[PDB]
Design a protein around this ligand. Sequence first.
Ligand SMILES: Cc1cc2nc3c(=O)[nH]c(=O)nc-3n(C[C@H](O)[C@H](O)[C@H](O)COP(=O)(O)OP(=O)(O)OC[C@H]3O[C@@H](n4cnc5c(N)ncnc54)[C@H](O)[C@@H]3O)c2cc1C
Ligand SMILES: [Mn+2]
Length: 455
Amino acid sequence: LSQDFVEALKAVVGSPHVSTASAVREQHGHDESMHRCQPPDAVVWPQNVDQVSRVASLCYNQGVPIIPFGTGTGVEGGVCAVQGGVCINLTHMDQITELNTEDFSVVVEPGVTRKALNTHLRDSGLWFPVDPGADASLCGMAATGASGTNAVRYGTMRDNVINLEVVLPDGRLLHTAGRGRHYRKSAAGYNLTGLFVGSEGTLGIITSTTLRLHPAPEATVAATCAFPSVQAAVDSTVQILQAAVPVARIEFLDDVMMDACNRHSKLNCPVAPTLFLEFHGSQQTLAEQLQRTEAITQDNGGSHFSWAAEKNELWAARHNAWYAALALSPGSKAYSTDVCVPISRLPEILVETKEEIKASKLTGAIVGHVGDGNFHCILLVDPDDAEEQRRVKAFAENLGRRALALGGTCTGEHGIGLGKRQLLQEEVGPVGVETMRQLKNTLDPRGLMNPGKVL
Ligand SMILES: Cc1cc2nc3c(=O)[nH]c(=O)nc-3n(C[C@H](O)[C@H](O)[C@H](O)COP(=O)(O)OP(=O)(O)OC[C@H]3O[C@@H](n4cnc5c(N)ncnc54)[C@H](O)[C@@H]3O)c2cc1C
Ligand SMILES: [Mn+2]
């Protein structure tokens, strides 16, 4: 980057909000994944959407790649600057606006996290349910198409994003569903909002998201249930879904993950394949769901439910499973798989994955949003041992391909980033790939919007 270009950036955002210092760039060259740190040439913090537009147009017309950066909690290398360029950290735009409690909607800027939003909504009777374990940017969650433990009942980001404000790569401002609009359904034209959810910063910069809010549950009950085997836990899961019990959360932990979480969080659950469950409803609604769910789990060998206000501890431990797995081998990094399959095929692939981790020299813990047919294999890697890194990559690719063989997808929520680009080509085939590329090319003709990712 030339000093003329750096001074032009400073003219837009202000001298304090541009940095070419190596330490600042290195901090913005990686996320939480094992993908090697690739530092951008500069980091820029725009203060309002006009500045985002002017930064993008400056980069775009000068041939400088743009990397949108939220909270850097992604796990597929989305923020790695594989071709250099300007990292745009969006978190100084941190305001909540247009809170419309009577319409169940709110507008947030990229610096707002889910925790910040739900704190703002305390005593409103409303909450935002999509819950990645990390304290992530909500606009980042829109960009990756995130989900979480609550998705089985309340939907993913795709279900709960109503509208997006997007700075296109050349600086034009798009409101995907129209400026200020919010509604429950529309057939007006082509649905542009869904194109930008899950685009990972390769189609434009999300500068605000309009989110669907939900009523807080009348009553809540949480529980854990220990099983004799992985098969018994996943069969119970499938049978619960096929019986249409509207569970609020249904999370699976294998024995390795249960032990890891015990050690990391001062939980002390029996070390066994375990379901964490949560139910929402009225008093009698809960009782009926509990009875039907306990009957199914018992038939598969489940323990009596170990019940859980502050006992928040349960789900905080789950949300930190990524770090619990890391702590099994301090100094390691982690790679996660993220397949999602037709639910009737979930038992076969989860059991086969357990058998394959056991038969291998890798350390892996299994944790999953199994109510969606989705699970994570969290594989640890020595950042220095390459033989291991190649064994971890090969394991993840084989798992991905088995999921594709079953009619599923290689990622339910984390995205493609750098890691799953070949699997995506296998998943949608040549006409799917060319169609996605044609969309990328019309929005980003010069290929400068987070290059090297997804496609
Ligand atoms: C402990 C832990 C638990 C997690 N649990 C979950 C989980 O349950 N579910 C889940 O889905 N994910 C989960 N994640 C992954 C991560 O939190 C999500 O993918 C999240 O959506 C990333 O948001 P971010 O702003 O931190 O992303 P970043 O790493 O900053 O960016 C991710 C990608 O999105 C792009 N991007 C970011 N912000 C924008 C923007 N405003 N406009 C356009 N593009 C943008 C970036 O360029 C990059 O390609 C977890 C991560 C951790 C560390
Ligand atoms: Mn997850």
